[PDB]
Design a protein around this nucleic acid. Structure first.
Ligand SMILES: [Mg+2]
Ligand SMILES: [Mg+2]
Ligand SMILES: [Mg+2]
Ligand SMILES: [Mg+2]
Ligand SMILES: [Mg+2]
Ligand SMILES: [Mg+2]
Ligand SMILES: [Mg+2]
Ligand SMILES: [Mg+2]
Ligand SMILES: [Mg+2]
Ligand SMILES: [Mg+2]
Ligand SMILES: [Mg+2]
Ligand SMILES: [Mg+2]
Ligand SMILES: [Mg+2]
Ligand SMILES: [Mg+2]
Ligand SMILES: [Mg+2]
Ligand SMILES: [Mg+2]
Ligand SMILES: [Mg+2]
Ligand SMILES: [Mg+2]
Ligand SMILES: [Mg+2]
Ligand SMILES: [Mg+2]
Ligand SMILES: [Mg+2]
Ligand SMILES: [Mg+2]
Ligand SMILES: [Mg+2]
Ligand SMILES: [Mg+2]
Ligand SMILES: [Mg+2]
Ligand SMILES: [Mg+2]
Ligand SMILES: [Mg+2]
Ligand SMILES: [Mg+2]
Ligand SMILES: [Mg+2]
Ligand SMILES: [Mg+2]
Ligand SMILES: [Mg+2]
Ligand SMILES: [Mg+2]
Ligand SMILES: [Mg+2]
Ligand SMILES: [Mg+2]
Ligand SMILES: [Mg+2]
Ligand SMILES: [Mg+2]
Ligand SMILES: [Mg+2]
Ligand SMILES: [Mg+2]
Ligand SMILES: [Mg+2]
Ligand SMILES: [Zn+2]
Lengths: 144, 155, 150, 87, 81, 129
RNA sequence: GGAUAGUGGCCUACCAUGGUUUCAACGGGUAACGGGGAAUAAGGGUUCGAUUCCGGAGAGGGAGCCUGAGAAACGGCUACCA
RNA sequence: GCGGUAAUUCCAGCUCCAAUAGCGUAUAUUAAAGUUGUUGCAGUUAAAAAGCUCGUAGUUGAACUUUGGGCCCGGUUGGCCGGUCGGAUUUCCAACGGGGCCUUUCCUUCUGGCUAACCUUGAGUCCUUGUGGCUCUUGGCGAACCAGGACUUUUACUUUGAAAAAAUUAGAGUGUUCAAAGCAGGCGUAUUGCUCGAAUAUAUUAGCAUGGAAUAAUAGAAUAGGACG
RNA sequence: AGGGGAUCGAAGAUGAUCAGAUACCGUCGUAGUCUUAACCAUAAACUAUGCCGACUAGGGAUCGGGUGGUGUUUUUUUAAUGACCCACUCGGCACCUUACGAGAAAUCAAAGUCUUUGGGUUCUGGGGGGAGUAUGGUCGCAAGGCUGAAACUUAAAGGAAUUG
């Protein structure tokens, strides 16, 4: 019958053997080890607000060549420090150092986006406004 | 469990309000009180015959039986006047549409009227809390032994 | 099968349909049942008796002419050994194997053989013990085992 | 293969192997249809009049085409001996 | 093959088969009324002795044991019942 | 060691139906095997079977016809519960309109449909088509 | 025997050596209150339930107590800690 | 994967698609996933069979014991008729189930209480030449279950049923103008009221109640320390 | 830890080669190689393929056992023997041809009787790298054995076959 006990009374084996092999299930383990709560910069949360340290220019990974403009962010809830991308043309002029940006994921479950090495977060709003808004020009960046 | 002595306590053992006037000369000395606990269990004559006191006897004591009637194989007889049976049972795991062996060890009080050895199937009856753990009482012995006198020596 | 090797040897008695008979067999139940006990007392295992009576005598199968296995004939005649004969012949072997290993620690293969045998012994007894023929506690033991057969 | 009120629906009630009665299907371009001849009084062999047997591609493939034919044409009357039920 | 009588196999193909693998399995050893003319009264022997059978009165011999069938000693007759 | 005498009997049958034969010799018989081989012929999926009496445990000889695609057995004879019998037939019968799950009830070994008219239930034995 | 509204190692005295455990005791974790339920729709499942109803626990952390039919109450008190 | 001078991917203009009072994005989980596999995987070479064998826990485990035949009772669909002023039931027919019998056959058991049932019969007969039919006391049915004594080898499975919260789910009824809802509402003499409602199912593992006696266990008479009396 | 230490020979030293040449070839030769007492527990320890049971297909060899023969040869006086021949039958190590079947294929009488999916049972695997790494435990005189993660990284890595 290969493997599995087929017995009518062998339920315990069968449920337990499961419990076990579930651990090779990648996200099951992450979920039970609480990897989210433990590692990872965000709290397990969808977003995090934090503060800008330096403006960075990361050269793109092959076979691409460019310079991918990012901000080193120190998360508020957390202290943990994180590099994050400033998307679309310009935008990196909206930021300035020591500003208060809201970060968010990149939709790869961790896992850096593209030709950007080791950045796993993107910017959504500075100084409370929305990057998008500022890009277009529906809105203007606040005071100081 | 008991056996021997009967009056082997610091306290004098006796049934509550079962007076014997010494003025009135008798041939049985001590008048005894017993009951039929009902539910169809003969009160073994070794409760009536006996001399043990035991206020937790379902036949010669102030405990009363009611509620669950269970049966289990006797698995331990090491505590004075109370044993510990093991009721086993198969349990249904529905994802797998199969069962697994579980069990429980219900501790129960046993009246001198019965003599029990380990392995005997027993039938217990629920009663008031009698101790820290025991909520049942030995009410019938079903087996006997395990064909023990037919395990003897040589021809 | 072959419970302790990879042997697969179909090899057995092919025993008669004729659950009674043989008609060319004269004699009597008296005859054999007597004859059985003669060798019982002369000191033979039910097996050796079944074998002797099969060749010299015309005892095709001692049950067919006396509805009774030989070991039953013996037991009911108070001629039944302490322990079952297969358990005996087992133990006996494990002893002689052992006495070999005493003289030859250098023979790991004996060690191996010994284990197997005792493990047959040990499991066999558990049966005999379960079905009441050996006392609920009977044990085989290297120490005592050698004295047990002789 | 009927239908609600009578009515023989669904095309094609396919053939059937005489040996095994498993279905002779379409892309089975491997089976066979043997027509044996109905003879008459002295040698003459009544054309257009047959006793027939159809054998699956499978049977012919397993080599059982001959033996099974024997038994078929004999307990149908056109072989006397040759075949035997016991073996 | 493909169709046959499993119920009534032939007296010869049931012949050659193994002693267990026949239709209803049975023995194929036999029994013998064996004589060595020094005697008058003959003894019954099983075709596969094991025990080297001795005669009734005289400690003569009779047959000797082998792999299977016994070898009957020297000047002897027999029968199969 | 030999562990479901029934499951073997069904396999043999199936493998002689596949190999294009018309007779199987099956060993070692059993009450159940018959009362399975009974349901089979009762819906004419085999011909006639004969019990030969080795003084042992038995031998059956099934003459079959080839109407049968597959007889099969359920190895842990699960408990079926009156309404789940549809669910079984569902999973393993070829169509709504024929072939039976034969199963074991307190009131006889019987195809699922007879097991409906009588309105009983029990365990699941095997199936036929 | 005391204590309780009352059974009971609840507590005490005396006495015994017991009770649980691979059918997982005991220990650890829980970003754990439990249930009615919720989400996903072949089926089998997987995941979720702080949160309209039921039950439970708490009222900054602990303990103690008055009143009373009912509280170990906190929009009652007394103490210690913060 | 596009972008290094004709960019079908960038920045725009034009044009166009999809969804539309909504549409994107992040995170989570669910389906897709037969990539957790009871149903339902894979393990020669892709990831994966312990160097070998013993072996306890665990899971598993050959066949065999009331089978076959005969008789009775009354059900619920369906047919061929309809008798009738849409549906009706008797005779006819199958077919599918249920009950109780006799075949050597515990039905736990005695002690009456009881009887519903015929081996009865006491008359004869409505009426088709009569076993087509039931009222009907005076020899002869046990079990239908009362209740008291005396006693009961153990289970698993399965059927049916009780006991069961509502909202939620499934679902009937009803024109909230539709609908999500809601449990309303509907009829008149609308001048002194009539009236239908507020269903049903699920509810499981455990416990209880009960019908079953296949499958699967367990116990019994071998030093007879057997069984009926 | 003794004994042994012929042979070959990790280390080391040379002769050559080479741009180099800590090597490949040649020399020397320590430990080792063998053995007893006790360790160690690993090999591509391989058939890279769990065990028990059943079923499904053809052929010639052969190994062990057994049955059968007015077989051959051994001669003596026929026998008895023993070896040999032919038919069979278990049970071995295998090979052959097919393929009803299986597979991604290579190939496979099992790797077959599986979406027509259930005989019993044990074990292991769940993208690649990180890594058999850290860590704890445990075993060992050591060397090391067993048990054995995660962070992070990454779009392939891999298999069999085809054509070049
Ligand atoms: Mg792993
Ligand atoms: Mg930096
Ligand atoms: Mg905080
Ligand atoms: Mg004690
Ligand atoms: Mg084994
Ligand atoms: Mg075998
Ligand atoms: Mg043998
Ligand atoms: Mg102690
Ligand atoms: Mg565990
Ligand atoms: Mg919490
Ligand atoms: Mg809640
Ligand atoms: Mg929860
Ligand atoms: Mg919370
Ligand atoms: Mg409560
Ligand atoms: Mg409170
Ligand atoms: Mg505290
Ligand atoms: Mg308070
Ligand atoms: Mg309050
Ligand atoms: Mg241009
Ligand atoms: Mg352009
Ligand atoms: Mg554009
Ligand atoms: Mg959308
Ligand atoms: Mg299932
Ligand atoms: Mg896979
Ligand atoms: Mg591999
Ligand atoms: Mg291996
Ligand atoms: Mg191990
Ligand atoms: Mg069985
Ligand atoms: Mg129910
Ligand atoms: Mg409702
Ligand atoms: Mg040397
Ligand atoms: Mg060197
Ligand atoms: Mg040099
Ligand atoms: Mg060097
Ligand atoms: Mg290894
Ligand atoms: Mg190799
Ligand atoms: Mg072959
Ligand atoms: Mg010969
Ligand atoms: Mg790329
Ligand atoms: Zn003689």
């Amino acid at each position: 019958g290969k493997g599995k006990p087929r017995g009518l009374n062998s339920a315990r084996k069968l449920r337990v053997h499961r419990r076990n092999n579930r651990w090779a299930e990648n996200n099951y383990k992450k979920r039970l080890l609480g990897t989210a709560f433990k590692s990872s910069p965000f709290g397990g949360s969808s977003h995090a607000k934090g503060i800008v340290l330096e403006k960075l220019g990361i050269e793109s990974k092959q076979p691409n060549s460019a310079i991918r403009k990012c901000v080193r962010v120190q998360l508020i809830k957390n202290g943990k420090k994180v590099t994050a991308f400033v998307p679309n043309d310009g935008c990196l002029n909206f930021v300035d150092e020591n500003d208060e940006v809201l970060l968010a994921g990149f939709g790869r479950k961790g896992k850096a986006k593209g030709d950007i090495p080791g950045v796993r977060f993107k910017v959504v709003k500075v100084s409370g406004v929305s990057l998008l808004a500022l890009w277009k020009e529906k809105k203007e960046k606040p005071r100081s | 469990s008991t056996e021997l002595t009967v009056q082997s306590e610091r306290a004098f053992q006796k049934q509550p309000h079962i007076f014997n006037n010494p003025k009135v000369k008798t041939s049985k000395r001590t008048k005894r009180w017993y009951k039929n606990a009902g539910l169809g269990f003969k009160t073994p004559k070794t409760a009536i015959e006996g001399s043990y006191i035991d206020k937790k006897c379902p036949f010669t004591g102030l405990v009363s039986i009611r509620g669950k009637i269970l049966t289990g194989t006797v698995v331990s007889t090491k505590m004075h006047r109370t044993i510990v049976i093991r009721r086993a049972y198969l349990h249904y795991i529905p994802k797998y549409n199969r069962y697994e062996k579980r069990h429980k060890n219900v501790p129960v009080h046993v009246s001198p009227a019965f003599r029990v050895q380990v392995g005997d199937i027993v039938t217990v009856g629920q009663c008031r809390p009698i101790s820290k753990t025991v909520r049942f009482n030995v009410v019938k012995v079903s087996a006997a032994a395990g064909k023990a006198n037919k395990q003897f020596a040589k021809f | 099968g072959r419970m302790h090797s990879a042997g697969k040897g179909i090899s057995s008695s092919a025993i008669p349909y004729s659950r009674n008979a043989p008609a060319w067999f004269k004699l009597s139940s008296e005859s054999v049942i007597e004859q059985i006990v003669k060798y019982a007392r002369k000191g033979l295992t039910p097996s050796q008796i079944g074998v002797l009576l099969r060749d010299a005598h015309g005892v095709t199968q001692a049950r067919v002419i006396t509805g009774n296995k030989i070991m039953r004939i013996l037991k009911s005649n108070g001629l039944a050994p302490e322990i079952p004969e297969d358990l005996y012949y087992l133990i006996k072997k494990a002893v002689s194997v052992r006495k070999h290993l005493e003289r030859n620690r250098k023979d790991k293969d004996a060690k191996f053989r010994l284990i197997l045998i005792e493990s047959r012994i040990h499991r066999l007894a558990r049966y005999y013990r379960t079905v009441a023929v050996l006392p609920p506690n009977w044990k085989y033991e290297s120490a005592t085992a050698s004295a047990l057969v002789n | 293969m009927e239908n609600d009120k009578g009515q023989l629906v669904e095309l094609y009630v396919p053939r059937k192997c005489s040996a095994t009665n498993r279905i002779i299907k379409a892309d089975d371009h491997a089976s066979v249809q043997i027509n044996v001849a109905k003879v008459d009084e002295e040698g003459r062999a009544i054309p257009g009049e047959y006793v027939t047997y159809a054998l699956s591609g499978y049977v012919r493939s397993r080599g059982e085409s001959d033996d099974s034919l024997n038994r078929l044409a004999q307990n149908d009357g056109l072989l006397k001996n040759v075949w035997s039920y016991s073996r | 093959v493909l169709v046959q009588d499993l119920l009534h196999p032939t007296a010869a193909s049931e012949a050659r088969k193994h002693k267990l693998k026949t239709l209803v399995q049975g023995p194929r050893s036999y029994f013998l009324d064996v004589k060595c003319p020094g005697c008058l009264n003959i003894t019954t022997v099983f075709s596969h002795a094991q025990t080297a059978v001795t005669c009734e009165s005289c400690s003569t011999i009779l047959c000797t044991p082998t792999g299977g069938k016994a070898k009957l000693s020297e000047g002897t007759s027999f029968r199969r019942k | 060691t030999r562990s479901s005498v029934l499951a073997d009997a069904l396999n043999a049958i199936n493998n002689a139906e596949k190999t294009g034969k018309r007779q199987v010799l099956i060993r070692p018989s059993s009450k159940v095997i018959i009362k399975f081989l009974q349901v089979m012929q009762k819906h004419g999926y085999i011909g006639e079977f004969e019990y030969i009496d080795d003084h042992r445990s038995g031998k059956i000889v099934v003459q079959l016809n080839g109407r049968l695609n597959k007889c099969g057995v359920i190895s842990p004879r699960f408990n079926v519960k009156i309404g789940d019998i549809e669910k079984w037939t569902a999973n393993l019968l070829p169509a709504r309109q024929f072939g039976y799950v034969i199963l074991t009830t307190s009131a006889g070994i019987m195809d699922h449909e007879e097991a409906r008219r009588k309105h009983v239930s029990g365990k699941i034995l095997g199936f036929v088509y």
